[PDB]
Design a protein around this nucleic acid. Sequence first.
RNA 1: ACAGGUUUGGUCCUGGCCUUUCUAUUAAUUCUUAAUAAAAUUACACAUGCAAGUAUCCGCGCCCCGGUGAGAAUGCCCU
RNA 2: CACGGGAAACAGCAGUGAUAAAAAUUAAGCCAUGAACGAAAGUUUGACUAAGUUAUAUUAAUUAGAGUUGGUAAAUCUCG
Lengths: 77, 117, 169, 49, 190, 86, 292, 55
Amino acid sequence: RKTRHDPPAKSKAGRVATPPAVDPTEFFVLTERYRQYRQTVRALRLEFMSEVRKKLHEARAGVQAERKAQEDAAEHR
Amino acid sequence: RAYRGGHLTIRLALGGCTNRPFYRIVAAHSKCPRDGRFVEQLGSYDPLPNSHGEKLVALNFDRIRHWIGCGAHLSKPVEKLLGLSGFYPLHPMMITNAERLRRKRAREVLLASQKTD
Amino acid sequence: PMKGRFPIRRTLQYLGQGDVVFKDSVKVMTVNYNTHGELGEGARKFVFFNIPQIQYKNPWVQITMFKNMTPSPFLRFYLDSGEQVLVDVESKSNKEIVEHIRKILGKNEETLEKEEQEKKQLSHPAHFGPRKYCLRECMCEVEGQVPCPGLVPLPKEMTGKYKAALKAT
Amino acid sequence: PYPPLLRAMILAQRQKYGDTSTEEPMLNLERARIDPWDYPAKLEAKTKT
Amino acid sequence: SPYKDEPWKYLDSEEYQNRYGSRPVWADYRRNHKGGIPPQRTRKMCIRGNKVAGNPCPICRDQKLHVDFRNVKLLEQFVCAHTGIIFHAPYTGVCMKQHKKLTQAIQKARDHGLLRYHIPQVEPRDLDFSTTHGAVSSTPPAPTLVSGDPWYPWYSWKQPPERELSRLRRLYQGRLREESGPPPELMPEV
Amino acid sequence: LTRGLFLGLSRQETHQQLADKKSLHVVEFREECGPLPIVVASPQGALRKDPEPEDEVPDITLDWEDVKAAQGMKRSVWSGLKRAAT
Amino acid sequence: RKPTFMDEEVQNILIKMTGLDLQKIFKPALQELKPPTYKLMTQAQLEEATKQAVEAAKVRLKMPPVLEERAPINDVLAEDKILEGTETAKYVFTDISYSIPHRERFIVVREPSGTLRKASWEERDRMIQVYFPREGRRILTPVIFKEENLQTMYSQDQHVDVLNLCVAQFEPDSAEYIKIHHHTYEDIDKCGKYDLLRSTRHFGGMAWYFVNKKKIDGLLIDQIQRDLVSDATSLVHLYHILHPDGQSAQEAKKQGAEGLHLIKVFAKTEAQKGAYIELTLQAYQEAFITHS
Amino acid sequence: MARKKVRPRLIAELARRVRALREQRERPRDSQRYALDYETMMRPHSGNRLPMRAW
RNA sequence: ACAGGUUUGGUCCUGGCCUUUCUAUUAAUUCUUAAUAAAAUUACACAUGCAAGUAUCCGCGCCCCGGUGAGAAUGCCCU
RNA sequence: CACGGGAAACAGCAGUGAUAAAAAUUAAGCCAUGAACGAAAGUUUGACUAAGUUAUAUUAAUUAGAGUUGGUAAAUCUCG
Ligand SMILES: [Mg+2]
Ligand SMILES: [Mg+2]
Ligand SMILES: [Mg+2]
Ligand SMILES: [Mg+2]
Ligand SMILES: [Mg+2]
Ligand SMILES: [Mg+2]
Ligand SMILES: [Mg+2]
Ligand SMILES: [Mg+2]
Ligand SMILES: [Mg+2]
Ligand SMILES: [Mg+2]
Ligand SMILES: [Mg+2]
Ligand SMILES: [Mg+2]
Ligand SMILES: [Mg+2]
Ligand SMILES: [Mg+2]
Ligand SMILES: [Mg+2]
Ligand SMILES: [Mg+2]
Ligand SMILES: [Mg+2]
Ligand SMILES: [Zn+2]
Ligand SMILES: [Zn+2]
């Protein structure tokens, strides 16, 4: 690829992007699909974040961690 | 190596041989090369149908959702694949392209019956 | 290896086979022994035989010897808490010292087996990549799949050259 | 609804632990609310908490 | 060769017994080379078209020998008795082509049970076998499925309100494309 | 080489000679036959009821070559070479 | 409470019937050989080593699980009609996570028809092999399990190998595991070859199959011609446990039959050939009593 | 990282301070910045051309 | 290394040198067709073309990928 | 090092001088992956995909030429 200080081409100079032809119906239906979908996936992601919260805290300050600590200290003494 | 910025991303690394592609589903930094270094390999995707007419996808779901649970972004074909599995909702573009395909089939059907005449 | 009195103890195998694994509390072990007397004997043998074994499996633990300071042989273990274990070894045999120490601060065979079990789940059978980390590289090498084209050249249709030469015409 | 496979996973999972409730697993969309793209973003730098 | 379809016959023949005795086929053959240690792979192939090259292999000097999966008396010689491993080509002195041919043949014969090898004792793949878990055993089908409806409402194509379509027609105006109606339900073939 | 060879082969100690001088059962363990204790030689005459003293660490002369072999420090390109039959 | 393979009674009867032959249990194997090791033992230590080898041979003798046939998996997780003509082939999604038991993994299939369904049994196992390979298993089913090849291997009396091959290749509840085990038992029955499986870990398999198919004939004849009648009576006993209500079991309850007389009871009431059994029992009894 | 012979690069700091200063001092008024040519649809400052859909 | 050649009129010892194996470049001589892999003299100088844009304006990107091994005993492993 | 100063930069893809025993296309596409931007259809990408070139190496067959013949070390006859 090119660099920040690499000058743009002479042919690409007078050109800017040309947007596609919009089919209004399908486009609208689509926008709805994406909003719904992204909403769903967002809920799922938050579900998973909660999961990670749980697993982390339980593997840290949870029951058998404390059991391990106490038991090991005990055996030690 | 140290970068400026960029994100954790689950994508397709292209392993493979000329005309015979294969994909390692991968938990990677965004700014490192495609086939290059990765945080963890998640699964694998074989694009070519085998002896039984099957494209094999293996997904480590526990780690997948661990990483999405850590805020990892999915690539569009990763999305398409997870949705095809039913782990995710069908991506809107799957459905849209399905429709476009149906309309192409319809107009080719009509064009066939018009040319036959 | 030829030179030395008990050359077997300079063998990788002998070093590997000595079993004592300290707890993570243990930082320093100090051996204090004598070069004379009948009683100190076992202690000497310990320094001569098992000290190498020990140190091999506990690479991060500092071990230090002191000769003819105290009239009696003993060990001292320095823990991370500041706790000091003093183990008197006197008429004790070499083996007795080892078993006693393994008793005090060891790791139960349960502990070690769980640890190695966690290390063996690190390499996952289903992955793909370098022979170093993985059982397989391509999926070309999995039985039912499509073969590496560098073994079994592909049918003309699956070739991108044929597809391009078709779309052209 | 949960996506079909994820749904089936949840079902089997609570079936494993002796939970007999056939009550349908449901995805709660309350916090999944997102503003449309027209919504202006704040230019003010975030205070880290 | 007359045998062909019945290769094993030649190994039971009196001319074979006369020629090779009870020793293997390769036992008397010696490889000519430049030094004390032989080249680490044998000559590639000893017969090119009509030309048989120099001093030919054990197998390819005698044409009546046939390499199949079938004759196990021949293939036996190229497998170790005690270690049940195939010899490398330098050991025997067979040409590379025929060594590969032999490896494949021995493979097919071990797959047809015609040749003995080690089948190890393995445990069952599973610790506890229960078809109980919901992965293997049928699930209680979703309320969406029992009805026959798309899993999500928006899987199905819904016609948009006309005011929204006109608003879009006002936004993208002149860049516009022919509006599309409902998708055909099922897709026909050619 | 041949004098030394024949001397060394002549000095061989049979399992039977060993069995007889130690007065014990010499028992062979095949790796392929597992833990199964094949008894090779038995001490004709009176067997011992006394077990052999167990040496935790044996004192034997070791050849640095065999040790280097066992631990995979022999990388010689000449050693693994494929040769013709015996 | 119908008697099962793993019942301590059935297990002890079949462990007894199998027998320990330390020479056939531990046999020279065709693996790469290393030079043997030698140690000097007392009579005591030799006895100890022998007993340890015996326990190891017990572990070696542990029986392959017999299960009835599994029920075909048909479940559809969803149907999307929108995906109908988009793909020519099927997508197979295997959950691979190292903690999950292989009965509990999720193997799903998207078809070209659009239906998201659970994978069948064969596809499921094949996929587990692909992603979790364990040695002895070809992903494609081996040519050797065709009838021709199996017949050839029977002619060479390799039956133990056939059974080990099937054990590693297929699954104890599968269709072909059972098909092949039963076909093999059928041939060792037809040929009177039972002693091949004698000290094998595979003996109680044909034992249980022959008790449940009600042919005890050739195995009793065999057991008594081997001059083992403790095993023949343990076998009739097993027949009585697995057929509690039947004329022989009831008549053995009635007559208060001792072992030899229990075999006579079974010879009379049920067994398809009583002539061979009574003649062989005659011969064994008379010859053994006169010789010893 | 730390190697005992490591050289003290001074000009790094100098270039840092100097660039920050010439950034604050020459910091453009947004008057000239967002200034636009309406015929060519081209910013003079950035040399950037505007999107078609925004014309 | 399973070793071999070579000191002397000759033997034994000590001791180098070389041979036999494998890989890569180049060169010479020869060369039919495919497939795959790999492509390497140069941190010397570089004509020409192309390699970074997207987006309703702001913005977000623009040695990230790709290149190379010049430099530094630089460093690996681990906090 | 880069404020400054020499000075006007391919150690991006192709190329070219020079130099060296050392010699790939001044080529086609974003269809697939990846990356950037976009709410999105999508656009861009000499990354890359598919091709071009070359006995450098494997493999397959259609393809026969090279070296050697005192010893080590397989193999020789007649002339000069
Ligand atoms: Mg490639
Ligand atoms: Mg801009
Ligand atoms: Mg020499
Ligand atoms: Mg001299
Ligand atoms: Mg001389
Ligand atoms: Mg060249
Ligand atoms: Mg080159
Ligand atoms: Mg680099
Ligand atoms: Mg320097
Ligand atoms: Mg260039
Ligand atoms: Mg540049
Ligand atoms: Mg040039
Ligand atoms: Mg040229
Ligand atoms: Mg692209
Ligand atoms: Mg694209
Ligand atoms: Mg291009
Ligand atoms: Mg070549
Ligand atoms: Zn491949
Ligand atoms: Zn040949």
